[PDB]
Design a protein around this ligand. Structure first.
Ligand SMILES: CCN1CCC(Nc2ccccc2F)CC1
Length: 284
């Protein structure tokens, strides 16, 4: 019974290798990866793969792997799919640990923009979690941490991490990770999946998908936000994506709002992530 080798990049940067039957649904591989990670609160996570256009796609656990990766390698990443708006409500510390690992990559990558002071505070909690109480013996005036804290490291940032790390004496790893998450969850781009688009006039915009709803980023002064309950239908057609808005109070007609995506694949991808978010955050 023929099996395909799968390679999964984990959130710590290491590689997990396993075999699944070649006609396996995504759930088979995801279950193996979550068992490897000792992860029970699996609903927030997913696997990604790169399509023939090198775009990130979620592996649908309900569909055959072979019908998603198609002609590409069986190579995946383990990622947070649904960012909990309140990580304190998660039942296990280990779930919060994986969510911290994802957010550290979101920060270093620049997907999650962050002030100097918040970069330093987040860094200080990671250092406290992983090394424990501050020790001057490992850091003179010229200390640089092996830890990656930011898209661009400066001596000033390193110095501020150390100053805040000193303040965390006695803090345990779960406690430090919770403080990490209490800060990160407040960031304006926390858990926002961004998609390049044009408005119905051809003006370049960004669509953000998140727990609360759909964001349109237009000209810096114009951000429009559509809470999920205001959204009755998500649809795509060719390179176009549309949202059907509930009729407002005393309004006779629903309204549909339309956007242009880079290509058909990008419109279908944005539709699927919106539907998934709407379903997940309707139930959570
Ligand atoms: C603080 C983290 N997060 C930032 C994006 C914001 N998005 C949003 C707000 C209201 C309605 C629809 C929306 F998409 C939700 C909170």
């Amino acid at each position: 019974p023929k099996s395909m080798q799968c390679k999964v990049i984990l959130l710590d940067g290491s590689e997990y290798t396993c075999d699944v039957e070649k006609r396996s649904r995504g759930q088979v591989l995801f279950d193996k990866v979550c068992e490897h990670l000792n992860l029970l609160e699996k609903d927030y996570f997913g696997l990604t793969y790169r399509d023939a256009e090198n775009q990130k796609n979620w592996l649908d656990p309900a569909k055959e792997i072979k019908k998603q990766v198609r002609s590409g390698a069986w190579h995946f990443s383990f990622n947070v799919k649904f960012y909990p708006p309140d990580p304190a409500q998660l039942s296990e510390d280990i779930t919060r640990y994986y969510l911290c690992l994802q957010l550290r990559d979101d920060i270093v990558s620049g997907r999650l923009p962050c002030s100097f002071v918040t970069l330093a505070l987040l860094g200080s909690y990671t250092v406290q979690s992983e090394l424990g109480d501050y020790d001057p013996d490992e850091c003179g005036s010229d200390y640089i941490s092996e830890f990656r804290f930011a898209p661009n490291h400066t001596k000033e940032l390193e110095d501020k991490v150390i100053e805040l790390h000193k303040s965390h004496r006695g803090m345990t790893p779960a406690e430090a990770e919770m403080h990490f998450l209490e800060n990160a969850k407040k960031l304006s781009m926390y858990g926002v999946d961004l998609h390049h688009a044009k408005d119905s006039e051809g003006v370049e915009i960004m669509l953000g998908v998140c727990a609360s709803g759909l964001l349109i980023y237009r000209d810096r002064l114009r951000i429009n936000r559509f809470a999920w309950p205001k959204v009755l239908k998500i649809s795509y057609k060719r390179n176009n994506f549309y949202i059907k808005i509930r009729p407002g109070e005393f309004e006779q007609f629903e309204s549909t709002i339309g956007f242009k995506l880079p290509n058909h694949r990008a419109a279908k991808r944005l539709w699927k992530v919106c539907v998934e978010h709407h379903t997940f955050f309707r139930l959570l």
